[PDB]
Structure formats: structure tokens, C-alpha cells
């Protein structure tokens, strides 16, 4: 039977969530909390509070994933709550601006930190990083198109690599702290900025760093026991990332003072140059391996999202096809890789993250209020675990705070993002809303011929 063959264990889910949550943010820039907090102890407080507020949302997606039990991770939940229109808007904006830009940016940072010991303070060449990024994207696309177990093995290996590197940084900081100095942690909370506009921006920066706890909800139909292995893996992977994020900043503040932290391009590179005499290239190599681990999880999640969106009536049905042996969604992965390679061609794509700062948390909060509305409207659905209504309410308030910040400040880019997200409405009312045997025949014949040729090339049929 040609179906999608559920092969994801508990360890694979833990490695997926940890390898998507820990990325380049803990390595190259844990600076926003310190620049808006102006103290060490208040920065550690803001890091712990951001970890708690991300646990509160991860529990809500554990309940949503065990209740609805369909892949897509907000697309399926908005379909189950307010179906049709808003789900298509979310699918359109993630197809158009969110996932190609993030995948291209992760690939570019991988390529930039692969060549950093050759170009220490040098302004590394531009065209050599785009080629390495394209090679990285094409290699991970091939690996995920071959087998699913190959992608889970890659995720396991590079998650172990980044965790071992962060453990090395933590152990060096702890042995220098307890050894003979302990100097910066004597007069903490001095010079602290106890204002609303500073604590709010520090919490915003700390809460962007915990992003990515919803990766396993995109692949829910491929987990062995989804009523057990999804919330157990979420509850395993949350305190690991929280403890690692606190202890890495403690190790950063033990060795470095505030001035050279706030005036460095990457804090971990300065840490490695100051505490490791030789073998200071280990840390940029580890940053490159961390970005290689994150790109694989992003590719798998985006391909499964586009698969489900194709199956639900949007996004024409070639993207729903499955390979007849080696049961992998090949044309979905091909479409995702093509879009990421197209977005690599645009110089200064780091501007483009300012356009979906508003939309991402808007759709997370929309899925949380959909969970609340389904708790009110359908109270007799089979829920294998239901929590209190405390967590969805406090995460609804947290997401309202998360979307209020890019609307007040940085207000021109948010309206551009809303225009980008609303730019798919000519496709919804003129193609999707109208049924078949009323659409133009010359479009249908062309799409059918292209689907048949792509089906013969990729050896892929729809699910039986």
C-alpha cells in the first residue's frame, strides 16, 4: 500500500525539536537580552522567563497534536477551527515568504561559518558562500528524497554534534568560574534597566530565541505512537534547551565582560579566541554543523506542510504524490528546494525577515484561539490528554504581546507583510472556491498533462 509509512521514534522526535530550536542564535547573537537588560542577572532572569513562556506554548501544541492528529501544525488546526480561508492564507504566506527565506538564510550562515577560519577578520567572498549554500540545499534535498531514515539519521548525528559543542563551552565556563575567578557574579543587578520598554524588548529577544518548538507537529502522521511519543518528546526537549540556554550565557558572562560581548560579531567566536589557545576553529566548525542540522529539519517540515496543503484541495495535486517504493514525498521536496534556490539569488535577504515578524506569531496565536474555540464548541471530541485552560489563555496573551511589538515599532514592514499574505486571494476565489467542471478546460488539460509527465519522471502516485 502506497502510504507515508510512519517511521519516527521518540529519539528522532527529540532530535528534531532540539536540532530546530538550537541554531545560530545561541552562538552568534545572544546580545539582545544583554543590550536591553544592561545587567547579567537580569539577563539570566529574562532567559528563564522566556523559557517558561515557551513551555506554556509547547504544551498547547502537544494537546492540539494529540487532539486533531493531522500533519501541518497550524494549517490543519486552523482548518479544523475556522477552515478554508485563513488556512489558505497561512499556507500561501509560508509558501511565499516564510520558509524559502529562512532556509536560504540558514544555508548562507552555514556557508559563512565554514570558511571563517580561513577568513578570520577578512570580509569573506560573496559568490563562494552562495555556491556552498546551493550545494548544501541540493544535498539535503537529495538525502530526504532518498529515504526518510537517512534524514532522521542526519538529524541525530548533527544534533549530537551541536549538543557536544555546547556542553564543551558550558564545561569550560563552569571550570573557569569555580576554579579561581567568579568575578563578574559578585555585584549583579547593578545598572539594571527596570523600564517597561527595555524589559519588554529583552523578553521579545529572548522569546525569539526559543522559536521552533513546533517542528514535530508538522510530521504527526509519521510518528509511531502519536498519543504517547509527541507530548513525551516535547516534555523531554523543553528543559534541555532551557538549561542549555541558561548555562551557555553563564559561561559567556564568566569569561567575557560586557564591553567585548556587546561589540562582537559572534560571541562564541570571541569566547573561543579568548579561552581556547589553539583549536579555536572548533567553535565556527560547530556553528556550521548546527546550521546544517537546522536546515534538514526545516526542509522536512516544509515538505510535509506542502504535502498536506496539496492533499486538502489547495496547491495542485502533483505535490500530494508518493514514490512507489522508497515511500518519500519527492515532488513536494523538489518544489521546496526550487523555491529556496530561487530565494538564494536575492542579495540582502536579511531584510526579508522583517516582513514576517508579524505573521508567524499571528498564526501561532490563531491556532491557540482555534484550540480554545474547539474546546468551547466541541467538548465531546476524543482527547487523549487535555490540560487546563490556563495555558492557552496565558499563551494567547503572550502572542498578543508578541504581535503588538512589530505593529507599534517597525510598522511599515508589518503592513507589507500583511499585503504579501493577502496577495493570494485572487487564487482562492477564482480557482479554489469554484468547483471543477466549471474551471476553464484549457487550464485543466495543461495541469493534467504536466502532472502526468511529472508523475512518470518522479515515479510517484497518490496515496491509496
Amino acid at each position: 500500500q502506497v502510504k507515508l509509512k510512519k517511521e519516527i521514534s521518540l529519539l528522532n522526535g527529540v532530535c528534531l525539536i532540539v536540532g530546530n530550536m538550537i541554531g545560530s542564535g545561541i552562538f552568534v547573537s545572544p546580545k539582545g537580552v544583554l543590550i536591553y537588560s544592561a545587567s547579567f542577572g537580569l539577563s539570566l532572569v529574562i532567559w528563564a522567563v522566556g523559557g517558561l513562556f515557551s513551555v506554556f506554548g509547547a504544551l498547547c501544541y502537544a494537546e492540539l497534536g494529540t487532539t486533531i492528529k493531522k500533519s501541518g501544525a497550524s494549517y490543519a488546526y486552523i482548518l479544523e477551527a475556522f477552515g478554508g480561508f485563513l488556512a489558505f492564507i497561512r499556507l500561501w504566506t509560508s509558501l511565499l515568504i516564510i520558509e524559502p527565506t529562512s532556509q536560504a538564510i540558514i544555508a548562507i550562515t552555514f556557508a559563512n561559518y565554514m570558511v571563517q577560519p580561513l577568513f578570520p577578520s577578512c570580509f569573506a567572498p560573496y559568490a563562494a558562500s552562495r555556491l556552498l549554500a546551493a550545494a548544501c540545499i541540493c544535498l539535503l534535498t537529495f538525502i530526504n528524497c532518498a529515504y526518510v531514515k537517512w534524514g532522521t539519521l542526519v538529524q541525530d548525528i548533527f544534533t549530537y554534534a551541536k549538543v557536544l559543542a555546547l556542553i564543551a563551552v558550558i564545561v569550560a565556563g563552569i571550570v573557569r568560574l569555580g576554579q579561581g575567578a567568579s568575578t563578574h557574579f559578585e555585584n549583579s543587578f547593578e545598572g539594571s534597566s527596570f523600564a517597561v520598554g527595555d524589559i519588554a524588548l529583552a523578553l521579545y529577544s529572548a522569546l525569539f530565541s526559543y522559536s521552533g518548538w513546533d517542528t514535530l507537529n508538522y510530521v504527526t502522521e509519521e510518528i509511531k505512537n502519536p498519543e504517547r511519543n509527541l507530548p513525551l518528546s516535547i516534555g523531554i526537549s523543553m528543559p534541555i534547551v532551557t538549561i542549555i540556554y541558561i548555562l551557555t550565557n553563564v559561561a559567556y558572562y564568566t569569561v567575557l565582560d560586557m564591553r567585548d560581548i556587546l561589540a562582537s560579531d559572534a560571541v562564541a567566536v570571541t569566547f573561543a579566541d579568548q579561552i581556547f589557545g589553539i583549536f579555536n576553529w572548533i567553535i565556527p566548525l560547530s556553528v556550521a554543523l548546527s546550521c546544517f542540522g537546522g536546515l534538514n529539519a526545516s526542509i522536512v517540515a516544509a515538505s510535509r506542510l506542502f504535502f498536506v496543503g496539496s492533499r486538502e484541495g489547495h496547491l495542485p495535486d502533483a505535490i500530494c504524490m508518493i514514490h512507489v517504493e522508497r515511500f518519500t514525498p519527492v515532488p513536494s521536496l523538489l518544489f521546496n528546494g526550487i523555491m529556496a534556490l530561487i530565494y538564494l539569488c536575492v542579495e540582502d535577504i536579511f531584510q526579508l525577515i522583517n516582513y514576517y515578524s508579524f505573521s508567524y506569531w499571528f498564526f501561532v496565536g490563531l491556532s491557540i484561539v482555534g484550540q480554545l474555540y474547539l474546546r468551547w464548541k466541541e467538548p465531546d471530541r476524543p482527547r487523549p490528554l487535555k490540560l487546563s485552560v490556563f495555558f492557552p489563555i496565558v499563551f494567547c496573551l503572550c502572542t498578543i504581546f508578541l504581535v503588538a511589538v512589530p505593529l507599534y515599532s517597525d510598522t511599515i514592514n508589518s503592513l507589507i507583510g500583511i499585503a504579501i499574505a493577502l496577495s493570494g486571494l485572487p487564487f482562492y476565489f477564482l480557482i479554489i472556491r469554484v468547483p471543477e467542471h466549471k474551471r476553464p478546460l484549457y487550464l485543466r488539460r495543461i495541469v493534467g498533462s504536466a502532472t502526468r509527465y511529472l508523475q512518470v519522471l518522479c515515479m510517484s502516485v497518490a496515496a491509496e
Binding site: 555556491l131 550545494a135 561589540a263 493534467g448 512518470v456 519522471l457 502516485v461 491509496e464
Partner: protein, 471 residues
């Protein structure tokens, strides 16, 4: 209708020779394209040239020093101790100064040579342990402490004119004692009154460098002629030496350009210090309309800028009634000078100048932030080029970082600049348009890129244009 193939008809049509060859051809073409783009990246990487190695700088290569010669005038009445100095290090860290030159604190009576001891503190400054408290308290805020060890600092002749050997023995013991106690450097002043100057300076520099290599020795002279300054720096070349070399004149700007380029040519672009005196304020030598220009110059020249206390607010010892002009009082607030009450206004004080964004303290704070972080202002290369009649223009550039252009107008007339460069290195050639960081006079706002061909200057104005690495 228009649905796709099922598994059986796909397995029967996608097995013909003609589709199999297409799939294998596309697979091999994809893999050779992947290897081709990897080879292109490897070829492009090994043809990007190189970048040179940093120069491993000392702590006095990274910003300005600050001389506090009289201690009781720096605070005021009663609180002129070494204990009261501990409460000023947050003001000193507002300036971002990297070192501090504490004046002579030891017991000197007068010309009696056998009674003065350089190891034991005069009790009018404190005792031995609050000096230690001060050293640790300054070490926490990243400020180094240099100790002045001039023997006869109460008296007209500064080096005990009768004997020469025993005072050299005094300084030789004092260097060791205070280096073990933990100071980060020394300063000896008035070395033109010391016979056999170049011999004792080499010995003291040896002892100080032999303890550690992050130690410093500063020498001061009242000379202004280049040949004596060069004569003291033949065997010694790691020595910072402060002099009256730039305090002569500069009524015309090409004269100051000649002085700076002649010094840097005559010493071979070694590390130097830039100041106007060995102990005196900038308002001992310049009118008040040139202080911003000289403060822009002293921060963007390749060396260590050295200032006395009160140079950052523009303190004048002749702006008020009677007073020793060798040691005026610092004007912290408006009750800093108790005598002749009401004579100090608000824009003459530290407190009243911190709010005005067009004050002199604000220019000092912006310039000393840019000096301690930009790599082309930390160890960049200096190059001056010719300009109009009465200008002084130069550029500082390191490798591939942001480059700085400084244009200064030492003239009482309007100038259009006309930067006739034409001789710069290819790594630092001038663009057509450059940004702005600041100006000394109001009328402009910064960040707006200005074109460098109709560049016009109002009198006594300096600019801090900036531009990135390109071709």
C-alpha cells in the same frame, strides 16, 4: 477525466527504455552539476587574496590617557584624598579613558635631597591601604593607573640640581617597589633638567619592561625642537614621550600638517603620543574657538592622545578670578568654587554640559567612543594629502574596514575644500560620496551622505566623513 495514473499503469509505462535512460541521465547531470558548483566555490575561495594579521596591541594603544596632576583640586575642599578619588571612576568611565596618570603622591619637603623618600606616601593624600583599594576599584572598571615619580615636585628645579646619582638610585628602587605593589606604569617629568637623560631612561624602561610587557613608562620634556625629541628616542623606542612640539603655533593649518608629517617621517611611523604639553591644559595655548578642532585632531591621529583634567569641558584657568593656573579647580557643579560666589555659569560645568548635545563634553564622549572601537582608528594607516590654502586633510584605513576622512579648517575665512588627492594608495582611494559622523559647528545633521567636490567649510570647522571598503 483528468486524474493521474494509478500504480499499475505507471509501472507499465515508466519502465520503457527511453524513460529509464532519461531518469539516469538527469541523475548523472544533477551530480556533475553539484560537483561543478563545489569546484567553483573551492576555486573562488583560493583566489580571494588574504588579510594581514592584527598587531597584538597593548592597553595604551586602545584609547586616551588622562592626567590628574593635582589631586585636591580635582575634587575640592577636604575630600582631596586617595579615598575620595574612588567615587570619580564612574565619571572617568563615561569618557572611556583607558588609563589614568596620578600625580606625585610621595613625601617631598623641598630641595633637601636626603629627606624625600619615593616609597612612602605623604599623609595628606591617604595611607598605603586606600591606595590598594583604589587600584582594585579602578581595575574593576578597566582603568589602569600610572604613577608620577618626579622627585622634586615641590620646588622650582624638579630633579634636585646638586646630586645626580642618588636620585637615580631613588627612582630605581621606586620602580621596583611600586611595580610589586601593582601600578601599571610610570611617568617622569622635566627630563631636560636631568643630566644623563638618555642613559637613565633606557635603564628604567628596561626594568619596567622586564617586570612585564604590559607596563608603560612615560617621559615628559618642555622641549619643542624635533632634534632633541629625536635625540632622546634613539636607543629607546618603546617610550611614550610628551612634549611641547605641537604647542608652538598653528596659526596656519599647513604648519600643523608639516609638524605632524615631519614627526611621522622622521621617526619612521612608530607609535607616538599626541598632546600639547607635558602637564598643561589645552586652554593654556589655544583660543576657545579652536578647542573642538584640536580635539578632533588629537583623537584621529595614529597614536595615544593624552589630556589633563578639564580638557573635556574646556576648563580655563583664566576664565575666573585669582588662582594658580598650574592647578585650577574642576567645576563639577555650580557650587564647585565657593569663593567669589555665582561666578560659575551652567555651561562651564560637568553637570550642565552633559545635557547639551552640542557641548564640548559631548564631542569628547563621541570621539572617544569612536577611537576605542574602530580598527582603522585603532591601528590603521595614516596618509595625508594636499588640499586648499589653510586646510589639513588625512585618511585612516586598515584593511577592509570602514575608512575615515578628516578635514580640518585652521582659518578665519570660508573654505571650499577641493580634495586634490591623486596620490593615495589604491586600497584607500576616495569615493564620490561619503557619510558624516559629526562636525564641530552646528548647521548639519549626521548620517546624510555628502558629495566631496563642492565641499564647503565655514570657519574653524572640522568634519568626520566615513566610507566603506570598495574599489
Amino acid at each position: 477525466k483528468f486524474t493521474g495514473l494509478s500504480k499499475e499503469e505507471l509501472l507499465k509505462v515508466a519502465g520503457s527504455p527511453g524513460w529509464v535512460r532519461t531518469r539516469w541521465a538527469l541523475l548523472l547531470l544533477f551530480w556533475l552539476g553539484w560537483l561543478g558548483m563545489l569546484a567553483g566555490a573551492v576555486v573562488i575561495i583560493v583566489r580571494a587574496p588574504r588579510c594581514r594579521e592584527l598587531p597584538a596591541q597593548k592597553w595604551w594603544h586602545t584609547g586616551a590617557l588622562y592626567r590628574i596632576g593635582d589631586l585636591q583640586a580635582f575634587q575640592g575642599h577636604g575630600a582631596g584624598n586617595l579615598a575620595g578619588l574612588k567615587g570619580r571612576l564612574d565619571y572617568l568611565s563615561s569618557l572611556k579613558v583607558k588609563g589614568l596618570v596620578l600625580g606625585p603622591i610621595h613625601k617631598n619637603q623641598k630641595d633637601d635631597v636626603a629627606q624625600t623618600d619615593l616609597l612612602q606616601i605623604d599623609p595628606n593624600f591617604g595611607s598605603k591601604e586606600d591606595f590598594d583599594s583604589l587600584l582594585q576599584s579602578a581595575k574593576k572598571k578597566s582603568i589602569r593607573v600610572i604613577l608620577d615619580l618626579t622627585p622634586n615636585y615641590r620646588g622650582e628645579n624638579s630633579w634636585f640640581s646638586t646630586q645626580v646619582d642618588t636620585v637615580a638610585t631613588k627612582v630605581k628602587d621606586a620602580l621596583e617597589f611600586w611595580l610589586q605593589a601593582g601600578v601599571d606604569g610610570f611617568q617622569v617629568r622635566d627630563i631636560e633638567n636631568l643630566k644623563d637623560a638618555s642613559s637613565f631612561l633606557a635603564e628604567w624602561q628596561n626594568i619596567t619592561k622586564g617586570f612585564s610587557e604590559d607596563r608603560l613608562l612615560i617621559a615628559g620634556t618642555n622641549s619643542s625642537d624635533l632634534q632633541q625629541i629625536l635625540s632622546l628616542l634613539e636607543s629607546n623606542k618603546d617610550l611614550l614621550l610628551t612634549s611641547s612640539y605641537l604647542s608652538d603655533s598653528g596659526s596656519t593649518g599647513e604648519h600643523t600638517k608639516s609638524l605632524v608629517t615631519q614627526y611621522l617621517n622622521a621617526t619612521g611611523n612608530r607609535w607616538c603620543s599626541w598632546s600639547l604639553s607635558q602637564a598643561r591644559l589645552l586652554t593654556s595655548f589655544l583660543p576657545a574657538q579652536l578647542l573642538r578642532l584640536y580635539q578632533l585632531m588629537l583623537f584621529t591621529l595614529p597614536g595615544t592622545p593624552v589630556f589633563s583634567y578639564g580638557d573635556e569641558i574646556g576648563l580655563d584657568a583664566a576664565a575666573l578670578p585669582g588662582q594658580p593656573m598650574e592647578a585650577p579647580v574642576m567645576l563639577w557643579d555650580e557650587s564647585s568654587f565657593p569663593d567669589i560666589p555665582g561666578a560659575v555659569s551652567a555651561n562651564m560645568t560637568v553637570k550642565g554640559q552633559s545635557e547639551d548635545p552640542g557641548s564640548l563634553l559631548s564631542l569628547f564622549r563621541r570621539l572617544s567612543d569612536q577611537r576605542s572601537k574602530e580598527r582603522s582608528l585603532l591601528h590603521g594607516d595614516f596618509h595625508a594629502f594636499s588640499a586648499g590654502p589653510g586646510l589639513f586633510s588625512y585618511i585612516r584605513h586598515w584593511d577592509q574596514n570602514e575608512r575615515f576622512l578628516v578635514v580640518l579648517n585652521f582659518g578665519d575665512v570660508g573654505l571650499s575644500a577641493g580634495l586634490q588627492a591623486s596620490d593615495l594608495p589604491a586600497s584607500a582611494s576616495l569615493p564620490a560620496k561619503a557619510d558624516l559622523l559629526l562636525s564641530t559647528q552646528p548647521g548639519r545633521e549626521e548620517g546624510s551622505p555628502l558629495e566631496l567636490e563642492r565641499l564647503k567649510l565655514e570657519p574653524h570647522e572640522g568634519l568626520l566623513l566615513r566610507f566603506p571598503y570598495a574599489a
